[PDB]
Design a protein around this ligand. Structure first.
Ligand code: FAD
Ligand code: HEM
Ligand code: NO2
Ligand code: K
Length: 398
């Protein structure tokens, strides 16, 4: 809607494409300096030293390039919406983001941002914001339970030298029944914690993938310890969960979220193989999926490709071997990067079939590298699914 508006928006594509991240960095710095209450929601680390500014810049760019038809973006809007919904973002949060976005645009564009250009962006923001609010309302409706609910930590077990699997059960009166919780392998939960070390003053929200779609004996997720290396601090919430949150303590969770999921129609057939490709703690939702595959159809050709620094840091070794031993047609491919090369294109060409249903998960950089290889091996987009442990929109070409 609005024809002169849409040309104005399009005329800013070049600045967003080349300077978009100057805009988004200014945005975060101003909004969070001026509005420290949002530090209870935004992950300081992703913006100051992570890829959050690139995720936003790419999304704003995609919206500007598709201003005539925003429906093109719906898969990205749903992906982001699942995170917003898990984080408890509501309609009444949207106007402040719009204020600060328009202000960052004005600041960066300078004399190249007249009132008409700003007005148009206000209009574009309203239309884009209305879409997200709508998707998210649906997600609030479908959520398995409402808002943050209290769980008790019932177990904490090392699944590698530096990865701890948490088992959580809902506190009685949370209205949550473990036997009546349909999980799709690939989903993550979100914790709302308030770490006490490092002079922390804010809540800290983090996503952790579910290790299993079985819930009867509690929900399970695994946290890698982001330890302190001379200079930079230990990861705030991973440290808090490893060292401070004991068995018996309460932790707050919002309901399972996310669009990462194994293709349900391909589970039960044998012609199309499954490739599960992980790095480090990225293994966690892939274990969930391997579990589902093996329980539903153990005859499917499966390729388990798992990279880690070394054997002690390789997570779920016994678990994975036991699941794999049940499969009649499996290749297990383990990489240890302390000695062995980082998985490259030739490795993938040699160790996995040309036409496969591929699910890959790990750090944003590992995802960027692996997608680049899978595209270079001519895999079709619709057979590559991935979940970066960070902002997915920083991994997408717009
Ligand atoms: C969909 C999704 C699923 C995820 N699933 C999992 C999972 O299953 N398991 C898991 O362990 N994680 C998972 N994550 C990542 C997880 O949510 C957290 O981001 C992770 O635990 C790190 O959080 P933290 O608070 O411990 O570290 P943060 O305090 O946010 O710090 C993050 C990293 O930055 C470093 N750092 C801090 N300050 C600086 C600085 N000044 N300069 C340079 N570096 C710095 C820290 O040491 C740490 O390594 C997932 C993320 C997403 C988006
Ligand atoms: C139309 C408006 C909005 C857009 C276009 C947008 C866009 C995005 C994008 C691209 C991401 C990163 C997700 C990913 O790449 O995986 C994100 C995450 C996030 N968004 Fe929004 N968002 C909007 C509204 C809001 C509002 C109103 C708030 C709250 C005030 C909010 C809070 C957050 C938070 C807390 C995260 C997680 C940040 C992190 O993980 O570091 N968003 N959003
Ligand atoms: O970065 N605003 O989601
Ligand atoms: K404020």
């Amino acid at each position: 809607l609005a024809e002169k508006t849409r040309s104005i928006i399009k005329a800013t594509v070049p600045v967003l494409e080349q300077q978009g991240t100057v805009i988004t960095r200014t945005f975060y710095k101003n909004m969070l300096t001026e509005h420290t209450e949002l530090l209870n929601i935004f992950n300081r680390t992703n913006q100051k030293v992570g890829a959050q500014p690139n995720a936003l810049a790419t999304t704003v760019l995609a919206a500007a390039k598709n201003i005539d038809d925003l429906s093109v973006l719906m898969d990205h809007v749903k992906q982001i919406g699942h995170k917003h919904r898990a984080l408890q973002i509501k309609p009444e949060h949207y106007p402040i983001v719009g204020e600060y976005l328009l202000k960052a645009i004005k600041e960066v564009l300078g004399d190249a941002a007249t009132p008409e250009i700003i007005n148009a962006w206000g209009e574009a923001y309203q239309a884009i914001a209305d879409i997200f609010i709508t998707v998210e309302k649906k997600m609030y409706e479908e959520a398995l339970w409402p808002g943050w609910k209290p769980f008790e930590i019932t177990a904490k077990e090392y699944v590698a030298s530096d990865i701890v699997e948490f088992t959580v059960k809902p506190k009685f009166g949370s209205g949550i029944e473990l036997e009546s919780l349909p999980i799709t392998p690939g989903q993550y939960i979100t914790v709302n914690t308030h770490p006490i070390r490092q002079e922390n003053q804010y809540d800290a929200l983090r996503h952790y993938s579910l290790c299993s779609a079985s819930t009867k004996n509690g929900l399970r997720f695994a946290v890698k310890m982001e330890a302190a290396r001379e200079n930079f601090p230990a990861g705030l919430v991973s440290e808090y969960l490893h060292k401070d949150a004991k068995v018996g303590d309460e932790i707050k969770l919002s309901a399972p979220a996310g669009d990462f999921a194994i293709n349900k129609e391909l589970i039960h057939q044998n012609e199309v193989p499954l490739v599960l490709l992980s790095s480090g703690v990225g293994v966690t939702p892939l274990l969930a999926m391997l579990e589902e595959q093996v329980k539903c159809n153990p005859n499917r050709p499966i390729y388990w490709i798992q990279s880690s620094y070394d054997e002690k840091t390789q997570a779920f070794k016994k678990h994975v071997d036991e699941l794999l031993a049940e499969c009649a047609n499996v290749d297990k491919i383990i990489v240890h990067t302390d000695t062995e090369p980082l998985i490259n294109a030739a490795f993938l060409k040699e160790k996995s079939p040309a036409h496969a249903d591929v699910y890959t998960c790990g750090s944003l950089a590992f995802m960027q590298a692996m997608i680049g290889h899978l595209k270079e091996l001519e895999h079709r987009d619709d057979m590559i699914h991935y979940e970066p442990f960070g902002p997915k929109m920083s991994t997408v070409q717009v």
